[PDB]
Design a protein around this ligand. Structure first.
Ligand code: ATP
Ligand code: ATP
Ligand code: ATP
Ligand code: ATP
Lengths: 578, 367, 379
């Protein structure tokens, strides 16, 4: 035992193991179990990071501090490192001699408790031959006879998958469920532990820093439990603050440092909103109007959703915003979204919904159910939002997906979550959801029969309503109708496309000038309300790019020249040059 | 009592030692009593306390603060969910019976199907119930169980398969939290094979997982929500008089959930549409949420009564429930505030006054 | 990678569970950073807190190698940890840290490297820097919750274009030394820009570097015939083009005439329908000229008409004339809605999941190709 276990009273008394705060009921049972006539061995079972070891060792602390029932007073708790019982072995029989020697020592002390953490690891030692499991074979009678007292500890999952197969062991200890504290209990736990962080990091925490670490961690960090989750924030903020005095920036850790740390851990930005990001955001609405012409209202809706979220007036558990972009083809429905993600500097997660035409294609978004082929793959959607929690999520031509696929978004739009096939949750609260569609267009573009042409603008009233179930629609922030582009827009579109052409040419060392007459001509020639801005690229392709490709490819316009294009008036034909 | 209670509440061990353990812990417990110098014998009440602790169930509520918490549970919920009183009452009645002891031998605390128009707090009330009671909410978006084979994610892969150690997500959630509110959202979206899992739960309080262990739902409140019948509810009839289609919505529910399912529910509660009175309450609720969000930035907010009356009058839509009201709040209050909070006077300001004129019915703003 | 290290240091500086885990896509510099810190410590490019501390890199294979008998592994494992605990100013670094979870427990037991490490991380006794990909982190580290709680995940993203150029400028001298080459400024900038435009299934820090290394390696085989030269933008372009399959610079050579005469080689084979020939010929020329569509296909043209008029023959002849692969897809075989899974594959969990997807594999194998969809109206 001398070099296999740790005397926890000795440790708790001299170095300290950090105080245990609260957990009155947890200890009440542990003691009542330890006080039983037989099988007086509690097992602390729970979610990782809830204080299972904190309690098991915390008991040693209470004993050395005298804060125990006299029954427990003066008893010694020893923690066993089973790794050391194997490190000292090699051939047959040495393990058992060593293992039993420790048991004899516990029996001889008579007033001691052994603590075995990771209790599910006591299964082992036997190998090659085996059948002698250690875990049960060397201790079943020790536990059932009351000769020794053992406190164990385990993760709830390990407990059911491993620590629960051996019924004989399952029967020999009393399980105590350690659940995670609530907000207040977490705050008091921090206050009790706080002096150790302040002492370790040479920092001090404000009342708000502590209050906030708990509330913020709960809201933003969701893969850990409260008592160790809020601590990471406090400890991390401490470690960060400790790196300031290096430039003499000695300071108290305040709520501002906590928010910076939570924001970094959760990858959700929070303080830059007060800095230059105010202008990046302020100007967002206009940068996008230089890329998508017309459609200002779509730009505003996106811009507004983002501003509210950055302002802090977002929702508590919804995507940044979620609206469907409907309209005629070639009007900037996907273009504004692509540009939004560029303007914001964030990842664009683009899915083509045309690929999800069968009901069973949902498995590509979620992953196969356990037990199936594609299980370890995970889901493509849930994974995309996990790697990039701050993103623009674009679902192109959503009306092409099998309609049951839309059901996947009900919980996304409403709770910001989606659960993958491993049970992990996607978190969409920092994702802008944009879905585009051509629903209703075929109808809006149809001519009616009669003397008076009917106004078919109520496409929203039929196709959008028939396609998207009421519960889907009632979760959208908006349904935004993109219009056909006007001729004023076409002129802007043509200018835009010519610039794109100029850039491709600049990269080849040549440049292009187009006269205004030539531009107006191309705009006038290509406009077709029905196809939006889509054909303008073809008009440019035929009137400017084809001529240029011949000049670029066969030597007429290569190194040494530039091309000027002008329109004549007689034929309205374009000129070219060098 | 140790013997007859252990067989009812402790189900992972055989009786000899299972009952002795109750006796032994009760013994140890009583042994730790005369430290206060109060000598004890072990009565039925001490046995019941031990079983309650071993089985992870509630003991006796009348002398507890739980008595008061339970007594006015309906009142607190009515402050969060307006209207739909009958749903609130059904939930609290089932709970009271269970704590009263007038429960079921082997069934969930109660089992309800929440049906009705959208935007009505079918989900909202369940979420608040778990908060009001202080217990874990176990959620399961049923839209994610659309294929016959998705059942294995609820109960785990069969042994020997790639998803065998993961276990089931449902049985594990229940095992970890035996006393909980279990919410199954949009249950009608799940593949019907899923309902077969629910039928046995509703009748026995239990599911066997892929490890052969059982989840005990005896202390779980089971609420599942649905939109079955909504498209029909919102349909307008042909004629001069619009018809009440709630009767057809039920026909839709009865086609999705077969008699075998329906007979295992304690109730099917058809939630009604929200009234204008409710909207006024809803608007105040949303404004308060806004005020809280603003307080977090150090900004106070006043909204006049007329501004409230107007927002409520503007946003009400009987068919869409309360969800649109939040849209009204975003456009009339949050957007203006975001600009002031982000680029203007409220950054280090801290105050905003909102009222409207009568001539334009436009809102005021500013520090 | 200043911020990536700032966080790593802040994690190492924590009181407990001060073990950063570097998680990211492959080829993004995760291990470059962990080794980079050892480099910075030695060079004095780190806070005094890290200064003078030793980072050791663990060979899991040598730790497990030879551990026969019951107890040798456990002994070696513990000896290592003891040595680290007695150093007091060291950090252990583990590549592919998810593999520690698979350390050899001898038999049916659970005593292995992860179970033996856990208490020393919780206690703050030792410091470990881990490294794993987002996929290995998800399928391995994410599952062992207790171990995962002892690491602080650092999210390492792919660098920008400007950042990639800068790492090349820093790394460059070693490629120059290794290959006996020198790289021009244009060569470096282009490796990054071109790799971004043309090389898929890789991340920048690696993608640009791979081009620099190969181009250096190409030039390394020139002064064997004493064709000594530097690596210019043209050489970088050639290397990327090897992968991209359509060079932007060779278009200026004999390729100009191969392309110029394309229209006539096709007119002599397909008669009438000159307009189809022109449509195809022009699309290619623009694409080779550089007047492409940035992200769209070379061109997409529906050929409609009476039978026996050369609609598929001209496309077949095009692929022949160009010297490129013809990918054929008979649309009549996709006569039903569900037949789409033949083109892209079955969803995960379904029979045939690992069979592939005919269209996506055809295109992936042959990036430069003519894709012909016969009788599209029959799909
Ligand atoms: N009363 C408490 N005493 C000590 N620690 C507590 C307490 N309550 C919560 N904690 C938190 O839990 C941790 C205490 O250590 P503990 O051994 O209990 O972890 P754990 O719950 O067993 O997690 P794991 O399964 O990974 O070992 C600390 O992060 C601490 O912030
Ligand atoms: N308002 C606009 N300003 C400038 N260019 C535009 C505009 N609208 C469309 N375009 C042009 O069309 C493209 C933008 O993509 P767009 O949003 O129109 O796709 P879409 O609306 O989804 O149509 P589809 O039905 O084919 O998917 C760009 O090439 C862009 O030059
Ligand atoms: N009776 C109510 N009182 C106040 N707010 C309500 C009420 N009912 C609904 N709401 C509003 O709805 C919001 C939550 O939506 P809810 O949970 O009710 O949708 P649902 O019941 O699931 O219906 P569906 O999903 O079919 O659209 C609440 O935050 C609340 O603002
Ligand atoms: N314009 C042409 N000039 C010379 N030969 C030709 C022409 N068209 C077709 N042919 C010949 O006739 C045969 C059929 O040609 P092809 O398959 O390309 O026509 P198609 O448009 O595909 O008809 P289908 O409607 O059946 O698909 C080929 O062997 C081809 O050599």
């Amino acid at each position: 035992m001398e070099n296999f276990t740790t005397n926890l009273n000795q440790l708790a008394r001299v170095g300290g193991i950090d105080p245990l705060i609260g957990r009155e009921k947890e200890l009440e049972r542990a003691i009542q179990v330890l006080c039983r006539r037989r099988k007086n061995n509690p097992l602390l079972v729970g979610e990782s990071g809830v204080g299972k070891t904190a309690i098991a060792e915390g008991l040693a602390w209470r004993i050395v501090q005298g804060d125990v029932p006299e029954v427990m007073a003066d008893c010694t708790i020893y923690s066993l490192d089973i790794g050391s019982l194997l490190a000292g072995t090699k051939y047959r029989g040495d393990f058992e001699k060593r293992f039993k020697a420790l048991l004899k020592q516990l029996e001889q002390d008579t007033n001691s408790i052994l603590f075995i953490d990771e209790i599910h690891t006591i299964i082992g030692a036997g190998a090659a031959s085996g059948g002698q499991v250690d875990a049960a074979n060397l201790i079943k009678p020790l536990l059932s006879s009351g000769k020794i007292r053992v406190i164990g500890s385990t993760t709830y999952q390990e407990f059911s998958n491993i620590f629960e197969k051996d019924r004989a062991l399952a029967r020999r200890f009393q399980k105590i469920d350690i659940t995670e504290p609530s907000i207040e209990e977490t705050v008091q736990i921090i206050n009790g532990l706080k002096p150790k962080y302040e002492a370790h990091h040479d920092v001090r925490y404000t009342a708000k820093a502590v209050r906030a670490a708990v509330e913020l961690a709960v809201k933003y960090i969701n893969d850990r439990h409260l008592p160790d989750k809020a601590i990471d924030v406090i400890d991390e903020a401490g470690a960060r603050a400790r790196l300031m005095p290096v430039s003499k920036r000695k300071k108290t850790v305040n709520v501002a440092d906590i928010e910076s740390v939570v924001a970094r851990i959760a990858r959700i930005p929070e303080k830059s909103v007060s800095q230059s990001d105010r202008d990046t955001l302020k100007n967002l609405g206009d940068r996008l109007k230089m890329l998508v012409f017309g459609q200002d209202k779509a730009i505003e809706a996106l811009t507004e959703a983002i501003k509210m979220a950055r302002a802090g007036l977002g929702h508590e558990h919804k995507p940044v915003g979620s609206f469907l972009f409907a309209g005629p083809t070639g009007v900037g429905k996907t273009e504004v979204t692509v540009q939004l993600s560029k303007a914001l500097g964030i990842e664009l997660l683009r899915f083509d919904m045309s690929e999800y035409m069968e009901r069973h294609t949902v498995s590509r978004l979620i992953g196969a159910p356990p037990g199936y082929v594609g299980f370890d793959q995970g889901g493509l959607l849930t994974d995309a939002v996990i790697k990039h929690p701050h993103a623009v999520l674009l679902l192109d031509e959503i009306e092409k997906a099998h309609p049951d696929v839309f059901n996947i978004l009900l919980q996304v739009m409403d709770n910001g979550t989606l659960t993958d096939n491993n049970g992990r949750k996607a978190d969409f609260r920092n994702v802008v959801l944009v879905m585009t569609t051509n629903a209703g267009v075929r109808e809006t573009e149809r001519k009616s029969i009669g003397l008076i042409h009917q106004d078919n603008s109520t496409d929203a009233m039929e196709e959008i309503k028939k396609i998207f179930t009421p519960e889907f629609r009632n979760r959208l922030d908006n349904i935004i109708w993109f219009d056909h582009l006007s001729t004023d827009v076409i002129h802007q579109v043509v200018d835009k496309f010519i610039v794109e052409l100029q850039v491709q040419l600049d990269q080849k060392g040549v440049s292009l000038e187009v006269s205004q007459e030539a531009r107006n001509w191309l705009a006038e020639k290509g406009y077709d309300r029905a196809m939006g801005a889509r054909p303008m690229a073809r008009v440019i392709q035929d009137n400017l790019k084809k001529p240029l490709a011949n000049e670029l490819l066969f030597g007429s316009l290569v190194d040494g020249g530039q091309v000027t294009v002008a329109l004549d008036k007689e034929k309205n034909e374009l000129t070219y040059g060098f």
